[PDB]
Amino acid sequence: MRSYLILRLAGPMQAWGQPTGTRPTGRFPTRSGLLGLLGACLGIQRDDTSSLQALSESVQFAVRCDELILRRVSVTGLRDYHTVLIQTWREYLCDASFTVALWLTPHATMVISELEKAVLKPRYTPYLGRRSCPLTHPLFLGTCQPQKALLNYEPVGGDIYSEESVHLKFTARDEPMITLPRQFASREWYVIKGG
Amino acid sequence: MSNFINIHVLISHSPSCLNRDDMNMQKDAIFGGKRRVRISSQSLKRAMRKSGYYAQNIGEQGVDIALSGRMDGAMSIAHAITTHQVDSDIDWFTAVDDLQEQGSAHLGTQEFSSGVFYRYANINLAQLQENLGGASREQALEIATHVVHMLATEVPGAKQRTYAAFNPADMVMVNFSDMPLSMANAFEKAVKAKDGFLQPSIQAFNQYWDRVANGYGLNGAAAQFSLSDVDPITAQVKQMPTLEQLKSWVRNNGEA
Amino acid sequence: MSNFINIHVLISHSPSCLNRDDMNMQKDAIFGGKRRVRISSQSLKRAMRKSGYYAQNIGESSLRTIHLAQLRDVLRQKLGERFDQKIIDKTLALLSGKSVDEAEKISADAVTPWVVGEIAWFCEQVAKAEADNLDDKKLLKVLKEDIAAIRVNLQQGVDIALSGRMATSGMMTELGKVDGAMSIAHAITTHQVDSDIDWFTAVDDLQEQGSAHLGTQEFSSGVFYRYANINLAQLQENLGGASREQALEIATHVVHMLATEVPGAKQRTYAAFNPADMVMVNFSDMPLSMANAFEKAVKAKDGFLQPSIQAFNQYWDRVANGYGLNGAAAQFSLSDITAQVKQMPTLEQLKSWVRNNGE
Amino acid sequence: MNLLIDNWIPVRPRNGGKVQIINLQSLYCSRDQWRLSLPRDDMELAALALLVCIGQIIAPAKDDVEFRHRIMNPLTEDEFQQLIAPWIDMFYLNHAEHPFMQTKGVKANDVTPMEKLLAEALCGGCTAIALFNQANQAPGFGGGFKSGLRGGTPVTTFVRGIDLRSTVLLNVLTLPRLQKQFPNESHTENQPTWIKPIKSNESIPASSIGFVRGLFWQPAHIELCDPIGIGKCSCCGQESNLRYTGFLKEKFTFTVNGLWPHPHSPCLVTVKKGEVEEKFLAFTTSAPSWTQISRVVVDKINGNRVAAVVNQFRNIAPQSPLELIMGGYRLERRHDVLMFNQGWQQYGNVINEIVTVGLGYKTALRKALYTFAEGFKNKDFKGAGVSVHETAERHFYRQSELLIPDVLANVNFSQADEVIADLRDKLHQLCEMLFNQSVAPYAHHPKLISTLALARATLYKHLRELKP
Amino acid sequence: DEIDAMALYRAWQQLDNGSCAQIRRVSEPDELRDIPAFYRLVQPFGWENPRHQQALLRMVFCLSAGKNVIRHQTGISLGRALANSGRINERRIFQLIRADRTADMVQLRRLLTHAEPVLDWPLMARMLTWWGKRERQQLLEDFVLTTNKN
Ligand SMILES: [Zn+2]
């Protein structure tokens, strides 16, 4: 088994990017977004591409949508009417929590050590999608040695979207070009449902 | 010592309507299972920027920019949520026309609620110092105190002239940490009214902090100024009798 | 010195029904956990506007209408001696943005408050513009340059300077828009209230067996907290640069009414003509509402009034000590209090204290 | 630059997250598994189309067994070279009188920026895809400019495999299937538009069109005013050393009579008692692509046929499930991928039943909110109450985008109506939410109360009828 | 573990004049708790189940409108039957909804007395146990739509 770094993405509101009148969310974090989160934790500035590209060539993700109890509470979504003195509608996610397995690709330069130090003492304010969205639980360190490391870190049974194969796929415009600053490519999530 | 400074505020507003959407309904949000009344981060942030206090103490030109960004901000402000579930009241108003005797000229409705809100805001200290060009931690801390004061004192303007929820904060807690964090989960299980919402909201906040803060990371200097008598969280959080003293404590970086 | 003047009032009404909604229910309101009987900020404001007190010490209220045909009729009557008829009409159409021909019915976008003096001043400007062969748009620019003159006309109708105006269609949209110096909050009962229902019958003198009508009405007695703050600079601006003392004069008049005036309904049948038992006025840099003194719904001891006032003072002391406030403060009460708030034995004295800006 | 020899194709390893520009030989011969990395969905689909067409004229499979084999093993380089020679001559993006999908000496005033081609500065690969897009999929400026052959918002439907090459190869007909789909072979010519032009105002038998000529059909007088950089592409992302900005338009008109048999889009036929008229599938509606899947996977013969590519697949591996790309235009891009489990070919009736379920719900929700909105209107209420069914239905459709695919991907076609009834549930709950959610901010108003009652009654009467 | 609405209905019909009258006098629902005949009537039907008694209180109080104003027969809604009476005006029903808790049960009883309604009792019983914002709303809707059918 290779090394995994586990994370907790959970806040009363979150918002994960999707193409546009309104600015809507998906139901889980995006890759562009998770990159955002991570680069943020590290000393990363938008202009300095080479380092961002190194990050993106270095890391891979698996995300678990897993839900509230009380009796359970399935995730709901709100529509924020957000104005500028120009009108926008901005979708946010209510009662979202995610567990995230993060592993290193056969490419360098990061080692999971660098990344947990980064997650622990972030250089940049971290936020679930928009800075409007603080998070309730710090990105806790995982250490554990597929989906199996997630089976370790409770709460179980929420199903996982992931870049390892196990098969259904779910196609998304998550993957950011870094050469065209704010655009994206066509990536595919592998889907592992339930248990 | 620690890089992020967390500001937690609990405030009770009287019947009011501090944020409308397209249809003049107040702004809701669902948490964790229940409806709560919301104030947008934008409304608060603007309430603070456009405030006179801010104009006086942040306007002093490049400091407000370093704090809040062009009009990229060092301080984050979160949508406020009510601690408890809320069903909005509806006021039905009448406009009496001085020239027609036989009726009203306009009939309408407006949504309104009273509510106990948790405002959260986190200031990145490294970010502020860099955005100012390497000002001292103490130099940063002054600005941070200003943010605390506003977060505790400033309320959005609508529709204040007609519903007038000019309420001061009942609870302000400030904590230092490595990773900025929100105590909103104290109220995920929506607080139930016992002799008001406010007091049990403060109980929830305190009990949560005890539990979680030693359970989670992190443990950095923390002080709380509160108006109500509830059994206060374990004395790893220093207790400030006045807001100004809390501010001075922030200035001195959690002295002890 | 201090810009905001805060007014806190505790008034106890007997069984009454002072504010109904469309279904003739009292106005419910929930705080923080419990139902409280509500009286609307609007009803209060109009109670003061239309009052004899106001009439006597402040002046004429504004004329708030949406029917421009009737408005031009009145304007034609009153201002007709002072100006040409065509001029009055054009002035009204320019301010309105709607066309004033001779039709029986003509309407603005929405109800608007008007001041006759204001319209008069505009008629003079419109007259100079017509004689000077000034273009209307040019007239707009010129009048737009100096707003204050229009605000001095606002000085004839104070309720507008206190409570504000908005326009969407007229020349007024650009010219006559006012914030309103005074913010007022809806009265709430300090304590929980479950409203009573009175069951009435109407007896018909011509039918002997039974009543001609049977019905119900909600009603409650309640101890209400009235709150209002006057922003003073805004008041001065809205009068076109009136003096601080003139503003303060307006403030004392407002204090008086907030303390003495009760809405009219259904007073003729339930008659809660009760004066305030506690009136507290403090100067500050930031407006402050003591409503939170009562988020914990007051529980009755020897009535609601006494524990409500006790609750009020306890919260005031606590807030003031916490946020270190040192603004001028005076309190007038009918009953049995904490220090450093000056005690006025009579209302008139509290008022003089406001006129003199904190002794 | 030449499409067959040099490298154009914007590309990314599936897992490998590094952008690269590769050449046809490389794509056809590496066990490398590539996906294309393009910033636009239309652009991606176009690139795919072009690559498919190319693969279709350079190397149709001799039999189904060879189809299989070639899908499973890349070609040796020599094999590819051999397959690719004649065509080499045809596929240059600069020439004297034969530039790829262009026409020489186009005259106009002034230039058109490369931008308008897409519907900036571009590399050879980026341009060639753009070109192919405007000539195949986009509406097309004129205005005295013909488009086709399909034509002007046609819906492309491709079969997807593992890898890029797996996909390309997968959508290329076996030679017998090919000369079956295009019989007559008395057709002047098979030579492409830019080799042996058409001239206004030609009148054309669809049957005179060779498959080469028609796959690469260009209906436009387009000339690429010569390249500048030395620098970086606006689609590709990377540096290109040769970039186009200039582009020359020219009006032109002909008429192809009757329907050409394009292999990439579902023919759908309608017969008025007057006239037997058939056209390719158009995204005419604002619906989620799933509504249309009855016409993309199920054959009916009024009625419809599916892309010869799809039907071929359905024949070739009957036991395999189906990954399907759907793309097109309204302007508004649309691009979705859809999976059907091992049953699909066999049971279309099940598929139809599901589409019908979705639609039936949408209908009930709409009938409800509409009667509310019509009531709203009648009482003269000011505001969006009039458009409630619109707004609402929009939300529904987004939700249904998420819902229906899941179902189809996972159904057990042989056994399962339980999962169908479960979807029936999910949808039921959905309509309830949306009714309440969009009628809510009005509902507290006394006058409206009557029309609300009706409304709700209606929502539930219909909703009962939706269940057996 | 619900309340057998029909058995309770019959039980109320079977009461002695002394008790039919003893319970009818009651002004508010809680005063039922001062009556012994109440406890006797209700106890088999699951009184002594805390989470049951509020419901039981309401049902009995509505029956207590007396003497037999509530007459039993897809089912017939209370809203529907209240309209079918034709005695009751919409405004009054609105007022039923707008009134706070105990008041609302009182007012309802007044309505029932005036309407002398033909409902489906166990239905009305269900609605009455779960009595809540939703249930109220439904009362309105059924009433208006029915009153409008006519
Ligand atoms: Zn390129």
PDB file of N, CA and C in Angstrom, chain B residues 28-92:
ATOM      1  N   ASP B  28     -32.957  33.184   3.748  1.00  0.00           N
ATOM      2  CA  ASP B  28     -32.859  31.911   4.462  1.00  0.00           C
ATOM      3  C   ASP B  28     -31.558  31.103   4.236  1.00  0.00           C
ATOM      4  N   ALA B  29     -31.382  30.073   5.050  1.00  0.00           N
ATOM      5  CA  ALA B  29     -30.420  29.016   4.794  1.00  0.00           C
ATOM      6  C   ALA B  29     -30.752  27.770   5.628  1.00  0.00           C
ATOM      7  N   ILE B  30     -30.477  26.585   5.100  1.00  0.00           N
ATOM      8  CA  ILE B  30     -30.823  25.343   5.792  1.00  0.00           C
ATOM      9  C   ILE B  30     -29.622  24.745   6.525  1.00  0.00           C
ATOM     10  N   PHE B  31     -29.809  24.499   7.822  1.00  0.00           N
ATOM     11  CA  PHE B  31     -28.745  24.030   8.689  1.00  0.00           C
ATOM     12  C   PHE B  31     -29.361  23.527   9.978  1.00  0.00           C
ATOM     13  N   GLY B  32     -28.868  22.425  10.519  1.00  0.00           N
ATOM     14  CA  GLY B  32     -28.184  21.466   9.713  1.00  0.00           C
ATOM     15  C   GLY B  32     -29.396  20.810   9.114  1.00  0.00           C
ATOM     16  N   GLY B  33     -30.504  20.849   9.829  1.00  0.00           N
ATOM     17  CA  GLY B  33     -31.705  20.313   9.243  1.00  0.00           C
ATOM     18  C   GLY B  33     -32.817  21.332   9.170  1.00  0.00           C
ATOM     19  N   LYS B  34     -32.559  22.549   9.643  1.00  0.00           N
ATOM     20  CA  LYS B  34     -33.664  23.498   9.875  1.00  0.00           C
ATOM     21  C   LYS B  34     -33.470  24.904   9.265  1.00  0.00           C
ATOM     22  N   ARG B  35     -34.576  25.569   8.961  1.00  0.00           N
ATOM     23  CA  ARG B  35     -34.464  26.896   8.385  1.00  0.00           C
ATOM     24  C   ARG B  35     -33.900  27.918   9.342  1.00  0.00           C
ATOM     25  N   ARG B  36     -32.965  28.712   8.853  1.00  0.00           N
ATOM     26  CA  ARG B  36     -32.404  29.787   9.628  1.00  0.00           C
ATOM     27  C   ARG B  36     -32.366  31.049   8.802  1.00  0.00           C
ATOM     28  N   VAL B  37     -32.467  32.189   9.465  1.00  0.00           N
ATOM     29  CA  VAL B  37     -32.417  33.457   8.760  1.00  0.00           C
ATOM     30  C   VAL B  37     -30.943  33.814   8.569  1.00  0.00           C
ATOM     31  N   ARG B  38     -30.606  34.366   7.405  1.00  0.00           N
ATOM     32  CA  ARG B  38     -29.211  34.576   7.000  1.00  0.00           C
ATOM     33  C   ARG B  38     -28.914  36.040   6.717  1.00  0.00           C
ATOM     34  N   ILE B  39     -27.704  36.474   7.020  1.00  0.00           N
ATOM     35  CA  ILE B  39     -27.227  37.743   6.496  1.00  0.00           C
ATOM     36  C   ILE B  39     -26.006  37.434   5.636  1.00  0.00           C
ATOM     37  N   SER B  40     -25.983  37.942   4.407  1.00  0.00           N
ATOM     38  CA  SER B  40     -24.932  37.585   3.448  1.00  0.00           C
ATOM     39  C   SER B  40     -23.602  38.164   3.899  1.00  0.00           C
ATOM     40  N   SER B  41     -22.504  37.473   3.583  1.00  0.00           N
ATOM     41  CA  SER B  41     -21.175  37.989   3.952  1.00  0.00           C
ATOM     42  C   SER B  41     -21.038  39.392   3.367  1.00  0.00           C
ATOM     43  N   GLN B  42     -21.599  39.572   2.177  1.00  0.00           N
ATOM     44  CA  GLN B  42     -21.540  40.834   1.455  1.00  0.00           C
ATOM     45  C   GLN B  42     -22.202  41.971   2.203  1.00  0.00           C
ATOM     46  N   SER B  43     -23.388  41.698   2.737  1.00  0.00           N
ATOM     47  CA  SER B  43     -24.099  42.696   3.498  1.00  0.00           C
ATOM     48  C   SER B  43     -23.292  43.126   4.715  1.00  0.00           C
ATOM     49  N   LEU B  44     -22.770  42.161   5.465  1.00  0.00           N
ATOM     50  CA  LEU B  44     -21.943  42.501   6.618  1.00  0.00           C
ATOM     51  C   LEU B  44     -20.698  43.266   6.237  1.00  0.00           C
ATOM     52  N   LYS B  45     -19.976  42.746   5.247  1.00  0.00           N
ATOM     53  CA  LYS B  45     -18.720  43.336   4.854  1.00  0.00           C
ATOM     54  C   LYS B  45     -19.009  44.779   4.473  1.00  0.00           C
ATOM     55  N   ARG B  46     -20.050  45.001   3.683  1.00  0.00           N
ATOM     56  CA  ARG B  46     -20.345  46.359   3.258  1.00  0.00           C
ATOM     57  C   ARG B  46     -20.729  47.229   4.455  1.00  0.00           C
ATOM     58  N   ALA B  47     -21.445  46.619   5.383  1.00  0.00           N
ATOM     59  CA  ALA B  47     -21.859  47.310   6.587  1.00  0.00           C
ATOM     60  C   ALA B  47     -20.617  47.811   7.321  1.00  0.00           C
ATOM     61  N   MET B  48     -19.590  46.968   7.348  1.00  0.00           N
ATOM     62  CA  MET B  48     -18.357  47.359   7.980  1.00  0.00           C
ATOM     63  C   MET B  48     -17.586  48.379   7.152  1.00  0.00           C
ATOM     64  N   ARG B  49     -17.385  48.162   5.849  1.00  0.00           N
ATOM     65  CA  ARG B  49     -16.628  49.140   5.058  1.00  0.00           C
ATOM     66  C   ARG B  49     -17.288  50.489   5.043  1.00  0.00           C
ATOM     67  N   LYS B  50     -18.570  50.511   4.760  1.00  0.00           N
ATOM     68  CA  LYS B  50     -19.206  51.794   4.612  1.00  0.00           C
ATOM     69  C   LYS B  50     -19.397  52.446   6.000  1.00  0.00           C
ATOM     70  N   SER B  51     -19.129  51.701   7.069  1.00  0.00           N
ATOM     71  CA  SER B  51     -19.321  52.246   8.418  1.00  0.00           C
ATOM     72  C   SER B  51     -18.434  53.458   8.674  1.00  0.00           C
ATOM     73  N   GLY B  52     -18.901  54.331   9.554  1.00  0.00           N
ATOM     74  CA  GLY B  52     -18.121  55.486   9.934  1.00  0.00           C
ATOM     75  C   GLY B  52     -16.928  55.111  10.779  1.00  0.00           C
ATOM     76  N   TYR B  53     -17.088  54.079  11.600  1.00  0.00           N
ATOM     77  CA  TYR B  53     -15.987  53.628  12.436  1.00  0.00           C
ATOM     78  C   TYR B  53     -14.818  53.237  11.547  1.00  0.00           C
ATOM     79  N   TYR B  54     -15.133  52.461  10.523  1.00  0.00           N
ATOM     80  CA  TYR B  54     -14.168  51.990   9.548  1.00  0.00           C
ATOM     81  C   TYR B  54     -13.558  53.174   8.823  1.00  0.00           C
ATOM     82  N   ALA B  55     -14.407  54.105   8.403  1.00  0.00           N
ATOM     83  CA  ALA B  55     -13.940  55.293   7.701  1.00  0.00           C
ATOM     84  C   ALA B  55     -12.912  56.067   8.528  1.00  0.00           C
ATOM     85  N   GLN B  56     -13.165  56.125   9.826  1.00  0.00           N
ATOM     86  CA  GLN B  56     -12.342  56.866  10.765  1.00  0.00           C
ATOM     87  C   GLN B  56     -11.036  56.171  11.121  1.00  0.00           C
ATOM     88  N   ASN B  57     -11.096  54.851  11.301  1.00  0.00           N
ATOM     89  CA  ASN B  57      -9.972  54.069  11.818  1.00  0.00           C
ATOM     90  C   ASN B  57      -9.232  53.248  10.790  1.00  0.00           C
ATOM     91  N   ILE B  58      -9.845  53.053   9.633  1.00  0.00           N
ATOM     92  CA  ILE B  58      -9.204  52.293   8.577  1.00  0.00           C
ATOM     93  C   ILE B  58      -8.888  53.249   7.425  1.00  0.00           C
ATOM     94  N   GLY B  59      -9.801  54.184   7.159  1.00  0.00           N
ATOM     95  CA  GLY B  59      -9.547  55.262   6.215  1.00  0.00           C
ATOM     96  C   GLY B  59      -8.426  56.181   6.703  1.00  0.00           C
ATOM     97  N   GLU B  60      -8.166  56.152   8.020  1.00  0.00           N
ATOM     98  CA  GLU B  60      -7.090  56.890   8.723  1.00  0.00           C
ATOM     99  C   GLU B  60      -7.108  58.404   8.513  1.00  0.00           C
ATOM    100  N   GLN B  61      -5.124  55.451   2.854  1.00  0.00           N
ATOM    101  CA  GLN B  61      -5.802  54.953   1.662  1.00  0.00           C
ATOM    102  C   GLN B  61      -5.495  53.470   1.333  1.00  0.00           C
ATOM    103  N   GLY B  62      -4.252  53.035   1.536  1.00  0.00           N
ATOM    104  CA  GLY B  62      -3.929  51.651   1.234  1.00  0.00           C
ATOM    105  C   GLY B  62      -4.141  50.609   2.313  1.00  0.00           C
ATOM    106  N   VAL B  63      -4.577  51.031   3.490  1.00  0.00           N
ATOM    107  CA  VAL B  63      -4.793  50.054   4.541  1.00  0.00           C
ATOM    108  C   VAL B  63      -6.114  49.336   4.363  1.00  0.00           C
ATOM    109  N   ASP B  64      -7.181  50.065   4.039  1.00  0.00           N
ATOM    110  CA  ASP B  64      -8.455  49.384   3.875  1.00  0.00           C
ATOM    111  C   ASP B  64      -8.341  48.409   2.728  1.00  0.00           C
ATOM    112  N   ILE B  65      -7.563  48.795   1.722  1.00  0.00           N
ATOM    113  CA  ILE B  65      -7.367  47.960   0.549  1.00  0.00           C
ATOM    114  C   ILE B  65      -6.651  46.687   0.958  1.00  0.00           C
ATOM    115  N   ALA B  66      -5.625  46.832   1.805  1.00  0.00           N
ATOM    116  CA  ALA B  66      -4.887  45.663   2.284  1.00  0.00           C
ATOM    117  C   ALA B  66      -5.731  44.743   3.140  1.00  0.00           C
ATOM    118  N   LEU B  67      -6.654  45.319   3.890  1.00  0.00           N
ATOM    119  CA  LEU B  67      -7.537  44.537   4.740  1.00  0.00           C
ATOM    120  C   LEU B  67      -8.631  43.820   3.940  1.00  0.00           C
ATOM    121  N   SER B  68      -9.332  44.577   3.094  1.00  0.00           N
ATOM    122  CA  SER B  68     -10.566  44.132   2.437  1.00  0.00           C
ATOM    123  C   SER B  68     -10.545  44.009   0.923  1.00  0.00           C
ATOM    124  N   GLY B  69      -9.443  44.412   0.281  1.00  0.00           N
ATOM    125  CA  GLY B  69      -9.282  44.242  -1.162  1.00  0.00           C
ATOM    126  C   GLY B  69      -9.840  45.374  -2.021  1.00  0.00           C
ATOM    127  N   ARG B  70      -9.513  45.353  -3.311  1.00  0.00           N
ATOM    128  CA  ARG B  70      -9.953  46.385  -4.257  1.00  0.00           C
ATOM    129  C   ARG B  70     -11.479  46.452  -4.298  1.00  0.00           C
ATOM    130  N   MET B  71     -12.027  47.606  -4.678  1.00  0.00           N
ATOM    131  CA  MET B  71     -13.484  47.788  -4.798  1.00  0.00           C
ATOM    132  C   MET B  71     -13.945  48.253  -6.196  1.00  0.00           C
ATOM    133  N   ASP B  72      -7.302  41.897  -3.347  1.00  0.00           N
ATOM    134  CA  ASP B  72      -7.694  40.653  -2.676  1.00  0.00           C
ATOM    135  C   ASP B  72      -7.529  40.686  -1.139  1.00  0.00           C
ATOM    136  N   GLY B  73      -8.675  40.793  -0.456  1.00  0.00           N
ATOM    137  CA  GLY B  73      -8.782  40.902   1.001  1.00  0.00           C
ATOM    138  C   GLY B  73      -8.118  39.920   1.972  1.00  0.00           C
ATOM    139  N   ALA B  74      -7.433  40.446   2.987  1.00  0.00           N
ATOM    140  CA  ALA B  74      -6.794  39.607   4.018  1.00  0.00           C
ATOM    141  C   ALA B  74      -7.814  39.045   5.050  1.00  0.00           C
ATOM    142  N   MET B  75      -8.933  39.742   5.247  1.00  0.00           N
ATOM    143  CA  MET B  75      -9.923  39.283   6.213  1.00  0.00           C
ATOM    144  C   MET B  75     -11.114  38.651   5.483  1.00  0.00           C
ATOM    145  N   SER B  76     -11.569  37.516   6.016  1.00  0.00           N
ATOM    146  CA  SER B  76     -12.745  36.792   5.536  1.00  0.00           C
ATOM    147  C   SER B  76     -13.940  37.007   6.450  1.00  0.00           C
ATOM    148  N   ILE B  77     -15.111  37.215   5.849  1.00  0.00           N
ATOM    149  CA  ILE B  77     -16.357  37.441   6.576  1.00  0.00           C
ATOM    150  C   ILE B  77     -17.374  36.437   6.082  1.00  0.00           C
ATOM    151  N   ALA B  78     -18.054  35.814   7.032  1.00  0.00           N
ATOM    152  CA  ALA B  78     -18.939  34.707   6.742  1.00  0.00           C
ATOM    153  C   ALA B  78     -20.374  35.100   6.829  1.00  0.00           C
ATOM    154  N   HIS B  79     -21.186  34.479   5.987  1.00  0.00           N
ATOM    155  CA  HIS B  79     -22.615  34.645   6.112  1.00  0.00           C
ATOM    156  C   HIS B  79     -23.027  34.327   7.533  1.00  0.00           C
ATOM    157  N   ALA B  80     -23.806  35.215   8.134  1.00  0.00           N
ATOM    158  CA  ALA B  80     -24.361  34.991   9.461  1.00  0.00           C
ATOM    159  C   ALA B  80     -25.563  34.043   9.401  1.00  0.00           C
ATOM    160  N   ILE B  81     -25.700  33.176  10.397  1.00  0.00           N
ATOM    161  CA  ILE B  81     -26.859  32.297  10.434  1.00  0.00           C
ATOM    162  C   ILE B  81     -27.542  32.413  11.799  1.00  0.00           C
ATOM    163  N   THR B  82     -28.849  32.155  11.870  1.00  0.00           N
ATOM    164  CA  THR B  82     -29.497  32.090  13.179  1.00  0.00           C
ATOM    165  C   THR B  82     -29.217  30.776  13.895  1.00  0.00           C
ATOM    166  N   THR B  83     -29.053  30.878  15.210  1.00  0.00           N
ATOM    167  CA  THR B  83     -28.672  29.746  16.034  1.00  0.00           C
ATOM    168  C   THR B  83     -29.793  28.715  16.105  1.00  0.00           C
ATOM    169  N   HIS B  84     -31.000  29.203  15.906  1.00  0.00           N
ATOM    170  CA  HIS B  84     -32.194  28.423  16.096  1.00  0.00           C
ATOM    171  C   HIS B  84     -32.975  28.424  14.806  1.00  0.00           C
ATOM    172  N   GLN B  85     -33.921  27.513  14.689  1.00  0.00           N
ATOM    173  CA  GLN B  85     -34.774  27.505  13.522  1.00  0.00           C
ATOM    174  C   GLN B  85     -35.673  28.730  13.583  1.00  0.00           C
ATOM    175  N   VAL B  86     -36.015  29.285  12.426  1.00  0.00           N
ATOM    176  CA  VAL B  86     -36.887  30.459  12.332  1.00  0.00           C
ATOM    177  C   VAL B  86     -37.985  30.352  11.265  1.00  0.00           C
ATOM    178  N   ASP B  87     -39.237  30.573  11.656  1.00  0.00           N
ATOM    179  CA  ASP B  87     -40.329  30.782  10.701  1.00  0.00           C
ATOM    180  C   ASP B  87     -40.633  32.271  10.598  1.00  0.00           C
ATOM    181  N   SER B  88     -40.478  32.841   9.399  1.00  0.00           N
ATOM    182  CA  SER B  88     -40.577  34.293   9.272  1.00  0.00           C
ATOM    183  C   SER B  88     -41.995  34.817   9.428  1.00  0.00           C
ATOM    184  N   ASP B  89     -42.103  35.923  10.152  1.00  0.00           N
ATOM    185  CA  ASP B  89     -43.367  36.605  10.353  1.00  0.00           C
ATOM    186  C   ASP B  89     -43.605  37.448   9.117  1.00  0.00           C
ATOM    187  N   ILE B  90     -44.867  37.781   8.870  1.00  0.00           N
ATOM    188  CA  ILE B  90     -45.232  38.656   7.773  1.00  0.00           C
ATOM    189  C   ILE B  90     -46.035  39.848   8.279  1.00  0.00           C
ATOM    190  N   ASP B  91     -45.558  41.043   7.972  1.00  0.00           N
ATOM    191  CA  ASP B  91     -46.252  42.266   8.314  1.00  0.00           C
ATOM    192  C   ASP B  91     -47.036  42.671   7.066  1.00  0.00           C
ATOM    193  N   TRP B  92     -48.291  43.031   7.261  1.00  0.00           N
ATOM    194  CA  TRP B  92     -49.161  43.431   6.181  1.00  0.00           C
ATOM    195  C   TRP B  92     -49.368  44.915   6.391  1.00  0.00           C
TER     196      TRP B  92
END
